[PDB]
Design a protein around this ligand. Sequence first.
Ligand SMILES: [Zn+2]
Length: 260
Amino acid sequence: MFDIGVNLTSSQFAKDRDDVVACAFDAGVNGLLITGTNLRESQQAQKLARQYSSCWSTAGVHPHDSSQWQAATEEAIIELAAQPEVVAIGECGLDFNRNFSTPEEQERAFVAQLRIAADLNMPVFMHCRDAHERFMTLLEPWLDKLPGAVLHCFTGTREEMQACVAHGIYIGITGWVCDERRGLELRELLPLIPAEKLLIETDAPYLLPRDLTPKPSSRRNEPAHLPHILQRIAHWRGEDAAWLAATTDANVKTLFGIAF
Ligand SMILES: [Zn+2]
């Protein structure tokens, strides 16, 4: 039961972070991957990972902040990646919907990170929004030199999903699928994702599962809700939850090279 997408540096967790973490482990979660989205967040993510047991982090620059990418940024990321806690380069990718940085700025930062990851032999943690065609064109030639790649918070079409899977890319699924309103579309394709390419996450504090029975709705999501998300996904795939938990943990071990 590993959460590959915890935004643990969020201010929403400022007052009770020690509690959020202890409750996650007590609920059966055995590992958290803390997302870094720019240099300062990545440094904070690594410090949090070193502070708590069973935590690792990513180091990179999100397309939104790619405008901040400079040569000095590159050095700082390489240095951060050498730390034991940092196991993946990213969040990186492309976002042609928001365009908070120009496409030109985005491509430069994304390619520079693919390059860092290939050099260091580390997997990449990616984001893609309304940029699938260009995204795959830039990513495709780097895959044979990377240990792996995951596209987290995947909400795309089955055609995009099949293309990603055909290239050996892991697919991250959140509680988004527990929303009768927006997630039915993704829910329908869950049976199509190869078991060996599926990773689960909460994207906490966001995306609180709507079908959450306890009913603490319209609130902060947290990793302690991962088991509920996994039960649901297993149900929609026809699988046993304990079996799915073991299979996804194996995928995490395979992709990131960690013991948890
Ligand atoms: Zn995610």
